[PDB]
Amino acid sequence: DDGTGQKQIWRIEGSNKVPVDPATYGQFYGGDSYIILYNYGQIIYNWQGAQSTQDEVAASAILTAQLDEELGGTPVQSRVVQGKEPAHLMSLFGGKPMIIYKGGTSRDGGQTAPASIRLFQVRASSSGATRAVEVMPKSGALNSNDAFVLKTPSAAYLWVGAGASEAEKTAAQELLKVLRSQHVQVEEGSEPDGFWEALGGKTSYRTSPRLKDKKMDAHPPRLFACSNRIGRFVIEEVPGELMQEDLATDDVMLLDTWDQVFVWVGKDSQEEEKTEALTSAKRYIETDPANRDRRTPITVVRQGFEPPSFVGWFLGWDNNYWS
Ligand SMILES: [Ca+2]
Numbered sequence: 001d002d003g004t005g006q007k008q009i010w011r012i013e014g015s016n017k018v019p020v021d022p023a024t025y026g027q028f029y030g031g032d033s034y035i036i037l038y039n040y041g042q043i044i045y046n047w048q049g050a051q052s053t054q055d056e057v058a059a060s061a062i063l064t065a066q067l068d069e070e071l072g073g074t075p076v077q078s079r080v081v082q083g084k085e086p087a088h089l090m091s092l093f094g095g096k097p098m099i100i101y102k103g104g105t106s107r108d109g110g111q112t113a114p115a116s117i118r119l120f121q122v123r124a125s126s127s128g129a130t131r132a133v134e135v136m137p138k139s140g141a142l143n144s145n146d147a148f149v150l151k152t153p154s155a156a157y158l159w160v161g162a163g164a165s166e167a168e169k170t171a172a173q174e175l176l177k178v179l180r181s182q183h184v185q186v187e188e189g190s191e192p193d194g195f196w197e198a199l200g201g202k203t204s205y206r207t208s209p210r211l212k213d214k215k216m217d218a219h220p221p222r223l224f225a226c227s228n229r230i231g232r233f234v235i236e237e238v239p240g241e242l243m244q245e246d247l248a249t250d251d252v253m254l255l256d257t258w259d260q261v262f263v264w265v266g267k268d269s270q271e272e273e274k275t276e277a278l279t280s281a282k283r284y285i286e287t288d289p290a291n292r293d294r295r296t297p298i299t300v301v302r303q304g305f306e307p308p309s310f311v312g313w314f315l316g317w318d319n320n321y322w323s
């Protein structure tokens with residue numbers, strides 16, 4: 001409907017279900033799971049932070065079951081994972097974006113504290129759904145297509161890539177509010193020396209003509225998963241926001257960015273899987289010549305050696321993820 005309805009949010013901790021500060025709703029901790037209750041018929045969502053411990057997810061289910069029962073099993077349960085939130089769940093916070101802090105809580109380990117120099121990638125969806133994810137404070141994390149927010153104990157910068165859309169921009173400010181800091185909007189390219197210092201690096205980040213394009217809207221990057229494990233090569237499309245966790249380490253991935261088609265080769269994929277993936281990249285291109293420049297390259301990249309211009313299409317990236 002509009003997410004405007006009333007709602008209560010809890011953050012599983014160990015085995016309990018402590019509430020979430022009503023003012024800090026739009027915010028969540030990736031290293032933890034949450035249980036939210038909404039009212040249109042009620043729908044309970046069971047969010048899972050990408051870096052949420054096992055016990056935290058397990059317990060979550062045990063609790064997300066009782067609540068449904070307390071309400072007479074009437075509510076419609078719904079499980080979701082970071083980055084793959086439905087259009088509805090993204091509206092539950094009015095216009096505000098969905099902040100995703102790094103860290104959270106755990107059994108033995110308490111509630112991890114922030115840093116001092118923090119960086120957030122603000123990417124918006126086709127429809128508008130904006131998310132702000134906390135990343136590693138390094139220039140190499142920058143990305144011409146989105147808007148970032150670099151916050152130091154002193155001042156904060158609102159970096160805006162050449163591809164950043166209006167939504168991502170405004171949502172950047174919104175994050176600034178939650179952070180509570182006077183920012184300084186800096187357009188990609190003309191940034192203050194006093195900025196790179198916080199990142200503690202020279203430059204070199206995820207860029208490319210295509211990442212800066214303002215017409216990518218005609219056809220946003222589509223990530224497909226090709227596997228051959230049932231006996232015949234079968235291709236499926238990855239839903240929601242593209243995420244590193246989406247890259248099938250046992251299969252082959254296809255990243256059509258229209259102007260170019262990447263074929264990501266999983267460290268544990270098969271050889272035929274790669275061979276058929278290539279042929280697929282070909283047919284995707286030859287599917288509509290009149291609109292697709294016949295000479296479109298099909299680049300082959302391997303897990304662990306992906307170029308920035310490729311990683312730049314994902315929301316968040318851990319150089320030591322598969323490590
Ligand atoms: Ca963008």
Ligand SMILES: [Ca+2]
Nearest residue numbers: 250251269270
């Ligand atoms: Ca496989």
